[PDB]
Amino acid sequence: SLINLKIQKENPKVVNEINIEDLSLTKAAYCRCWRSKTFPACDGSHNKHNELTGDNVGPLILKKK
Amino acid sequence: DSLINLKIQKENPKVVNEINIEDLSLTKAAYCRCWRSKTFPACDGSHNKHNELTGDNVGPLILKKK
Ligand code: FES
Ligand code: FES
């Protein structure tokens, strides 16, 4: 049932705040699988998780107007 | 190690959500990273029960504006 295996395990609730107006990218993918090496950004690790596990998780994509 | 999402759109082989800056109403909006929210992709604090039951430490992503 653990979702997060390794990230900031000394912190009892990992919460990331992002300033959506400071997007340096036209879109930006944010991780919902707790496997990204760029966490809280998405690096595509979700694909390795889904393949390993048979899961169907993917990122939240933030997009500029 | 094992499944993260148990229930949400299991018919969909990859659940991706997009959000437009301009569609964000509030100065802050919480997005779920635990796959337990009844308002997915929004966070409704279901992570708290998940954390208490499993000894996990997951929390939402907060998008801040203005
Ligand atoms: S690396 Fe986790 S959702 Fe993409
Ligand atoms: S309900 Fe899932 S992170 Fe809050």
Side-chain angles (χ1 to χ4, degrees), chain A residues 20-60:
Chain A
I20 204 94
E21 284 154 329
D22 290 316
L23 268 182
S24 39
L25 278 77
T26 205
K27 38 153 147 27
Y30 269 77
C31 177
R32 294 189 304 189
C33 79
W34 301 80
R35 304 294 180 272
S36 180
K37 299 299 168 279
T38 60
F39 189 88
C42 173
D43 66 359
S45 295
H46 60 268
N47 295 125
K48 305 198 182 194
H49 164 79
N50 286 345
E51 221 55 84
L52 266 175
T53 266
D55 210 354
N56 66 333
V57 293
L60 185 71

